[PDB]
Amino acid sequence: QEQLVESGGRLVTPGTALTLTCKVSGFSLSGFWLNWVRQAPGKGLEWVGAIYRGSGSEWYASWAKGRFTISDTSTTVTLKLTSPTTEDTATYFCAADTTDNGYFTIWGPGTLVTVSSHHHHHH
Amino acid sequence: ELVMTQTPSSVSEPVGGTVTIKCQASQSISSWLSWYQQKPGQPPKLLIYDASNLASGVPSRFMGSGSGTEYTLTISGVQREDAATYYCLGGYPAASYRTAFGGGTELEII
Amino acid sequence: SDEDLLKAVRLIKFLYQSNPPPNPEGTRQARRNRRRRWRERQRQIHSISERILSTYLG
Ligand SMILES: [Cl-]
């Protein structure tokens, strides 16, 4: 039934424009809020923004505007990071509101974005 | 614009004890308040919706209440599986003040 | 804020436009079921509208 899968999580250098995709499947509903939430390692959940799926109605957090673009597709919702910095390192989740009432009932497993000028290193 | 102030940052409770978690809204949100549970390596899970309703598949020990600007998440008979991090979510995406998460509460069980 | 308000109204307008009235034939219990289901959804949109708008009106 209802499923959300996020992809696009990569290791990027600062300023490298990146797009994450939320594969939306099994939703009977036509229009609903599809939200983007991020979590930096060891930190709290942060709301980035949302799009109301039937429309082109995009809503962003005060800090997110200009840095993030949410776009709706036929079977997908994308989140573009226009100019990432080290502060944008986080797991990005997509979360759907199935009622229009504001709360998130379905979540994706998340996609990890790391912003660094360095390649990976083992611990 | 909307700020959800969540207290405490951390709680340690023995099995069978009562846990109280609070969220204060910087603006009037009415029933636009939900509670989430997050365990390591997993996405968050809905516990309470519309401030006081128990979500599908959640133990009855989880209780939500709201009075004006103050919201409370109570866990009455804490179990070992309740060790997690908790978050409130206030507001609405199209509201003037948007929607926002509280800073979270890390619950440890003794 | 002014562009947010316009965007919220265009959104509310979209929501109302997404719940059009069903065919009023009154044929089956399914015809009056659709009307009941339409009304519940209308009331919800009315309530979502007022709450969104009150954040813009103070
Ligand atoms: Cl904001």
Side-chain angles (χ1 to χ4, degrees), chain B residues 35-103:
Chain B
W35 292 98
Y36 301 85
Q37 183 196 246
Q38 193 186 32
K39 299 189 175 186
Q42 284 186 1
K45 185 195 177 181
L46 183 74
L47 300 176
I48 304 287
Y49 67 97
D50 303 343
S52 55
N53 297 327
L54 190 65
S56 185
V58 180
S60 61
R61 70 183 170 270
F62 293 88
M63 289 112 172
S65 76
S67 176
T69 248
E70 192 196 86
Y71 300 90
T72 312
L73 176 67
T74 303
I75 313 159
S76 84
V78 303
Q79 295 312 121
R80 289 268 233 273
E81 63 261 39
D82 303 343
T85 144
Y86 297 81
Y87 300 94
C88 66
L89 173 73
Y92 199 73
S96 63
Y97 50 65
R98 300 302 183 267
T99 182
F101 282 104

Side-chain angles (χ1 to χ4, degrees), chain A residues 47 60-63 65, chain B residues 1-2 96-100:
Chain A
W47 185 79
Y60 298 94
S62 62
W63 60 268
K65 53 198 187 195
Chain B
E1 179 90 77
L2 192 247
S96 63
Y97 50 65
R98 300 302 183 267
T99 182

